[PDB]
Amino acid sequence: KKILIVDDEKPISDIIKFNMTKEGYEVVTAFNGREALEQFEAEQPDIIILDLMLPEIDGLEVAKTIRKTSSVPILMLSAKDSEFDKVIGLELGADDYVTKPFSNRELQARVKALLRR
Numbered sequence: 001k002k003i004l005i006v007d008d009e010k011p012i013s014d015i016i017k018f019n020m021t022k023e024g025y026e027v028v029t030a031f032n033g034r035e036a037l038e039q040f041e042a043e044q045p046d047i048i049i050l051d052l053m054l055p056e057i058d059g060l061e062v063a064k065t066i067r068k069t070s071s072v073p074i075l076m077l078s079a080k081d082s083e084f085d086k087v088i089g090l091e092l093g094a095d096d097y098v099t100k101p102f103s104n105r106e107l108q109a110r111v112k113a114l115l116r117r
């Protein structure tokens with residue numbers, strides 16, 4: 001399975017990439033919302049892990065535009081942790097929303113759960 005991870009902070013991207021690689025997934029990375037849409041279109045990932053505070057196009061906008069054409073599972077992963085943030089993330093089309101700082105094991109279990117369903 002192929003995972004697109006979208007995050008502008010390279011240290012975070014690297015941590016998540018390391019963890020997905022350990023699970024046997026193929027990893028693609030994007031570092032802003034424009035790269036996220038371009039990678040989504042070129043790579044057709046099986047799942048997207050999506051940060052929200054991103055250069056160029058923010059993650060909510062990325063999720064909304066992906067949803068215009070695709071039902072690819074989207075797991076938002078953000079320091080934005082308010083009721084409002086989670087609710088609008090899910091309403092716009094995210095299948096799950098996990099906050100930073102996060103457990104690596106839980107992230108792995110949530111990716112598996114989304115892929116399962």
Ligand code: BEF
Binds near residue numbers: 077
């Ligand atoms: F920059 Be992410 F929304 F933590």
Ligand SMILES: [Mn+2]
Binds near residue numbers: 007009051052053
């Ligand atoms: Mn960010």
